[PDB]
Nucleic acid binder design. Sequence first.
RNA 1: AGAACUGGUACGGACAAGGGGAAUCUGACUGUCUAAUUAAAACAUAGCAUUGCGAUGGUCAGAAGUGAUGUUGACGCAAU
RNA 2: UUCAAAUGAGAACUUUGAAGACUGAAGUGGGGAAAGGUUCCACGUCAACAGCAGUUGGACGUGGGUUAGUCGAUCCUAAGAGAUGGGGAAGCUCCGGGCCUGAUUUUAUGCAGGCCACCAUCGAAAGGGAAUCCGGUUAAGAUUCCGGAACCUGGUAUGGAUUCUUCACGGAACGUUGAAUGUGGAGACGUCGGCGCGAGCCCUGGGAGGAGUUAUCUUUUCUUCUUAACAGCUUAUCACCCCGGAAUUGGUUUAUCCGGAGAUGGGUCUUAUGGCUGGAAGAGGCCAGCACCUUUGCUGGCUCCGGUGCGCUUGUGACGGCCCGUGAAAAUCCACAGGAAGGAAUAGUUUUAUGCCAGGUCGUACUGAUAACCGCAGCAGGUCUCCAAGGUGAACAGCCUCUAGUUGAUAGAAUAAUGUAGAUAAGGGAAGUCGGCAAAAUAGAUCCGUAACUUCGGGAUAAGGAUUGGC
RNA 3: AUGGUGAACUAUGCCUGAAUAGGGUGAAGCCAGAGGAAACUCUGGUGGAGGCUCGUAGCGGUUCUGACGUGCAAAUCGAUC
Lengths: 40, 92, 51, 95, 254, 63
Amino acid sequence: YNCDKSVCRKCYARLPPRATNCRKRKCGHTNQLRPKKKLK
Amino acid sequence: MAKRTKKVGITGKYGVRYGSSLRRQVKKLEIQQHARYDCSFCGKKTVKRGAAGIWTCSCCKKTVAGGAYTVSTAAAATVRSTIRRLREMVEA
Amino acid sequence: MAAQKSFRIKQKMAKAKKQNRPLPQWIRLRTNNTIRYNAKRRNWRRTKMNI
Amino acid sequence: LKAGKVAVVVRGRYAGKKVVIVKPHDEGSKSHPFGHALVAGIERYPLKVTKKHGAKKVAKRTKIKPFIKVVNYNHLLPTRYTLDVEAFKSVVSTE
Amino acid sequence: MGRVIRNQRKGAGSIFTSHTRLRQGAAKLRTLDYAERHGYIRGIVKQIVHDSGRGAPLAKVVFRDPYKYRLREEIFIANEGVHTGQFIYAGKKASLNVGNVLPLGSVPEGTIVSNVEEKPGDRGALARASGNYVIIIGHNPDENKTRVRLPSGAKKVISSDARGVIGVIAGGGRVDKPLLKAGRAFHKYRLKRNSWPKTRGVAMNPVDHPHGGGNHQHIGKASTISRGAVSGQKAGLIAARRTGLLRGSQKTQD
Amino acid sequence: RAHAQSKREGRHSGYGKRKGTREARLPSQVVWIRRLRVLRRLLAKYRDAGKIDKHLYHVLYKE
RNA sequence: AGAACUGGUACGGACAAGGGGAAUCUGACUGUCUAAUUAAAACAUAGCAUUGCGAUGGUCAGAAGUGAUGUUGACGCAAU
RNA sequence: UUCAAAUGAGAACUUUGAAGACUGAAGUGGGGAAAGGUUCCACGUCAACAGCAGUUGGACGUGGGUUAGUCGAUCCUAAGAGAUGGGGAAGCUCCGGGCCUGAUUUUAUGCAGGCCACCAUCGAAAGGGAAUCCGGUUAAGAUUCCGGAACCUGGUAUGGAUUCUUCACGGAACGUUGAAUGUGGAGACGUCGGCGCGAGCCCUGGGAGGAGUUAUCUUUUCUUCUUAACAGCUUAUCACCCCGGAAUUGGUUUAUCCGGAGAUGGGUCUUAUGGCUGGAAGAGGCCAGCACCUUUGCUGGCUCCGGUGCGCUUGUGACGGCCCGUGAAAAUCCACAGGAAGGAAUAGUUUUAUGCCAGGUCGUACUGAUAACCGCAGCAGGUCUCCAAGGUGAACAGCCUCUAGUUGAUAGAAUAAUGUAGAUAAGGGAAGUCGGCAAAAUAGAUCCGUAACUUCGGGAUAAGGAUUGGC
RNA sequence: AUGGUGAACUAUGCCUGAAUAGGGUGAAGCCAGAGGAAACUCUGGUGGAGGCUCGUAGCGGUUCUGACGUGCAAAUCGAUC
């Protein structure tokens, strides 16, 4: 089941679930994170 | 009723086939399991089937044994009366 | 992590890469005998580092 | 002069639930994974076996536990008193 | 000769066993400290939870009685009409209420019992499955014997010291409705000590079964078999006697 | 933006146009989801303003 | 949803997007198959039966252990 | 691809620009798991390689690069590899006391006493789990390093407290010592349908900031308008509330329902967030004109204003419906108790707080594929994850746009039959072929309509017909 | 014939994880009105059931008996299903 790392919906860079927010470069609280649907 | 003619209950699941006799049994036990039953304790029409042979009361939360399909049967009721008849005589 | 992380394994695969290197000019020069084609040579696409 | 934090809850579970806040250590006693913070309930006759939280969450029931013990005691005092009356009648009766 | 035949494959091997670890357990009947003149075994059912191991319900009972050794708990067998908040007493001077466990000697004649010991302390051998039941026909004060009628209808003579639980086991009338689907039957098979789906022997090749071979499907030979026969030789109707369907009877009886 | 500003403003909602299907537009499940919420909210406002009676509200609620 | 005036050969305008009806045979159905010439009517199927089996069960693995049966059970398990 | 141009001894394929397409759940984006095993980065060679040149490259050669208390392994336990009596088998092989202390003494020496059940390790780099983000920098690393800021884990220090015959508060719920001893939650766990919280998104306008652009015009229309864990405030949802208080055919949902084992009112409570605020944060780096060889440096945008479309998408939190089928288990955080014993200007805890040392393990490059994986190959093959929120469509399709990615290892000139993909064919309409095989054909959706038969569920989108724009 | 050695393929199993765009259809049984002494009924409705249908990720492999057949490939490719 759950927590992986969270994958940016804009940049597509994987940042933590424990981080609220995303960045690859100035994404900076774009919040644009989906956690991984925990595998297959 | 429903937009139904006779009485499916469950039957729609089957689709068409299965036959009158076979589908009737499978209708009777399950539709009677679904039927609102009074709990002995509260008296509200609570009882639902938790699992096969598990019955639970929504209001009281007392859970009880019974038939798989129905909360109770005739058979179980017969057993309880005879033990009680034996028990009564012994006690006096 | 990754890959393949095991510390012991990693070293063997690393160790092997250096071992598969070209000769030093000198051994051809002080010389034994040998049109010195190393041989051990291991290869980009081809062969396999060893199973 | 502040806000904050115990549990009560819910009713999956096991009966509950009422318990009381000794305070908050590192957070309140506030549903999660790992329980950090604190429950009691003040101790002797609701008899609460409890739940802390930080951890999402179960007590056995506060009125019902004093009633189970008080009614148990109440059952006992009468069963014992009946056994005591029963014992009086049987010893006393013939010879 | 053959390839190994299915029966021989049961044998042992992982494909044959049940997934024993998904089973909650046994639920054998405990072994009295002593007495039990009412409530030195006192249980309350707090829950009813399904056993995948017999497709019938168990009752979780606890049991609180003392010492060091004390023994207590667990999942004893549920009967019909047994419920959460109802009391269980297990032993000799227990009341004759459904769900209470006692030796057959203490039980009144003509009361349905389930879960009866073959031998004392073996914890409950008999009648057993969902909605099955023993009837204790006879006692008297018998020091010597208690005569019990099994669910098969055989009369067994068992010792009066054998415990049993009063009532029939819950979930009866489970056989009554048919599964109706392969899919329903499947999930049920995963629970038990079984390989299925099962292909017919006649459907098979001669190498796979004695019943196999032939253009058209047929048992080449008869079925009714010689009891001496090896595992591989014995398929079909084992040591039958008569076949079809439509007569007989009787309790036979030695 | 221009297509949307042209859809204030009826259109592109023709017989030819509508696809996906009658009930993929609006199955009436979604319409019922909006409407059923309206009905119980308006009933609440009716009660609190004190219109109509508690007995009439029951018949009407049910309706 | 409804109306208008009017154009185009055409208003699903492109691409995408079911051709329909009847007779008969088989197999009730969903499912399963020859990895690499057979996807079928074959197999499974759930329904219906006989037979063995009272427990250290019979039945199957196995020298013994011990396993498998079953921590279950004649409303169940096995074999067909 | 073409066309200038860069360079080179040499240029169709190296590179620069322009102009053009194509890729779109990825016939060519982003980030990884396995595996590879240095392919990475730099430079310099071109014998050999790349099915062709080749200045090029992933050839070759020569150096260099991977930095972890806070990512993950380690730890745990799972389906069982199974150490492990005893017993077969010569044998290989194969099944089935340990823990806690008290005299001393604070160094731990040392004499002496007391408890208890079914026992090891390993097993998932994707189960479960203690803690970290923000941006800055490298030729090549980065949530590791650094600048700022934070936090944890393990095993102690101490003023400031408090609380001191082991606590006030609030009718209540609740709120802000400690051995012998039992018992437990969290972790913790199915599938269907399923409302609500809410965020980021799509989007629009009023609007701040900076782009594209007129044979001819009106506005157009555009990039945008950034902010962390997590300090501490919150109007605090649902659910419980057998709270008090009230005393009923009324209350109430999407639906089921709930109640007089007291419904609604209505004084409270508990209590969620990747949540709203508030602060972290006058923390911090880029475009635009301007200066400078560069280093540097400048203000404003970062202290915008409100909302819609149920887009139930995820994180969370109701529930109803559900199975002859019942949805794992542990380490560890913490708690209820149930109490010997110890509370005098002495002495005793529980901490905020800030210190106080440490953190000692191994991995981190890169590819992750029509060129680094597997298949003898730079193989049209196979092989797991996330990104289901890019814009118009949602009936599939197609085209896009600031993500981003590319132009496959052959070209040139022409264009015959033959052939391989492919379209359209007079008018006729299965005559062809085993066979209407194919292909055409029908097509969305609304309205109206709908036969035999039938286990009344179906047959059924029967059939048949009509309608549909642009506005 | 004897001794080992392969479940990275594959068969089936178990444990542990995850995936299934969108839509149509339309069972439980429940609300309104109206029939009804009741049993029940009709008609509107609502809610959604299914080894459910049309179809996406994914999985399968019918057909051209097409291409290929010293292949791209020691069973590949399209279009169809």
